[PDB]
């Protein structure tokens, strides 16, 4: 409980690590601004070494020093009372090559990754003739794959009945041992709600979800 790194403190109390393996002012718990989980929500996703770069001194290390090796750990916790119900899925997919809505092009940069701001899924299709937009129908999960089979990646179920939080540890997964970080995004954190959030009248109508990222052993 109350682990600290640099000049930040996060208080916790289970962990699921990578594929079995384990991974100077940059070692601090960055915290993206929390999103709101409503009834009619579909899901959110962040590209991992892009959401850190636009804001942190880790990103100040990025603009001086392009090429690097990093190893992440991710805390995700949502606080809700005993009267809410619903189930999440926290998964961290490597090399998420998403597909465009228009059949002949590829999506542009600002649609694949908001700088430390959560891009959101939807539960319909999207238009095709408009611009370079990410095909974001949720049941195909953006990669043309069945969303039920997504648990082959390292994942952790958040279920508000018993569990409350989820901690992941991801090692460095790349082919080249040293690649430029500005044109490449190797990890992708996805949060999809399967059982939608339901509550009675009188309780608060949304549950906040906070995402805490902390890089460990960044080599340059």
């Amino acid at each position: 409980r109350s682990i600290t790194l640099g000049n930040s403190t996060i208080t916790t109390q289970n962990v699921v690590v990578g594929y079995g393996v384990w991974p100077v002012a940059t070692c601090r718990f960055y915290t993206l601004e929390s999103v709101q989980w409503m009834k009619n929500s579909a899901g959110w996703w962040w590209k991992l070494p892009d959401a850190l770069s636009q804001m942190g001194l880790f990103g100040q290390n990025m603009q001086y020093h392009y090429l690097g090796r990093t190893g992440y750990t991710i805390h995700v916790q949502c606080n809700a009372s005993k009267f809410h119900q619903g189930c999440l899925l926290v998964v961290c997919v490597p090399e998420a090559e998403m597909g465009c809505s228009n059949l002949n092009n590829t999506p542009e940069f600002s649609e694949l990754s908001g700088g430390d701001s959560a891009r959101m899924f939807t539960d319909t299709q999207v238009g095709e003739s408009n611009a370079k937009k990410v095909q974001t129908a949720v049941w195909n999960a953006g990669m043309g794959v069945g969303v039920g089979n997504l648990t082959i990646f390292p994942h952790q179920w958040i279920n508000l009945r018993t569990n409350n939080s989820a901690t992941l540890v991801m090692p460095y997964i790349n082919s080249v041992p040293m690649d430029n970080m500005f044109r490449h995004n190797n990890l992708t954190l996805m949060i999809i709600p399967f059982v939608p959030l339901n509550y009675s009248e009188g309780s608060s109508p949304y549950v906040p979800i906070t995402v805490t990222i902390a890089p460990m052993c960044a080599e340059y």
Binding site: T106, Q135, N140, V145, S175, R183, H184
Partner: protein
């Protein structure tokens, strides 16, 4: 029984990945193919289950000929020979049937007469990186990854037509050897649309039934 489900026994197969025709007299008759796994649909699904692969390569070519309709006067031709040139990534590329790029030095090529065994050749794993990447979330244009470029192939006759043209076909086969896989993926559900990228149309999850019970 489990040895039929190993990764080596799952991919060490063969498939007719290309089929092209070229004639000898039409001044642009030469076949051309870039090596990529994403040509045939049935092999692409079996290789997109994993993300990082690393395999050697073994190619065989079956070549046959066919007499085009000539004019007259009892055409007799001797046996043909075929030249199959292979270009590494970052080399010269021909553009006509007679160019400098065929008589170059560092492009390995075979010569094969008809009526013999088909000409097997074998290419080792060529990359600056450590493994091929069947998926790449990043720019080089989006999702190209110019590191895993395996090279091209080129074919032509080494004869000049005397009284009748001859067209010829070629069926390039394909066989990975000593495969190692890494970080598996869920199998692709939606149909394939374009060869170069991963685009798709949204589709349902499973063929329906009438109700829950």
């Amino acid at each position: 029984s489990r040895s039929e489900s190993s990764i080596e026994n799952f991919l060490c197969r063969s498939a007719c990945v290309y089929y092209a025709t070229y004639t000898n007299n039409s001044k642009k008759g030469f076949a051309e193919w870039v090596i990529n796994t994403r040509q045939v649909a049935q092999l692409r699904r079996k290789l997109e289950l994993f993300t990082y692969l690393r395999f050697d390569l073994e190619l065989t070519f079956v070549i046959t000929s066919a007499q085009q309709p000539s004019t007259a006067s009892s055409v007799d031709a001797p046996v043909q020979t075929h030249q199959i040139m292979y270009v590494p990534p970052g080399g010269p590329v021909p553009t006509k049937v007679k160019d400098y790029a065929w008589q170059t030095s560092t492009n390995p090529s075979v010569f094969w007469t008809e009526g013999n065994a088909p000409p097997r050749m074998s290419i080792p794993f060529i990359s600056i990186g450590n493994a091929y990447s069947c998926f790449y979330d990043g720019w080089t244009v989006y999702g190209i990854n110019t590191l895993n470029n395996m090279g091209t192939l080129y074919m032509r006759h080494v004869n000049e037509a005397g009284q009748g043209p001859i067209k010829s076909t070629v069926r390039i086969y394909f066989k990975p050897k000593h495969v190692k896989a890494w970080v598996p993926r869920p199998p692709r559900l939606c149909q394939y649309e374009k060869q170069k990228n991963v685009n798709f149309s949204p589709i349902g999850v499973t063929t329906s039934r009438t109700d829950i019970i």
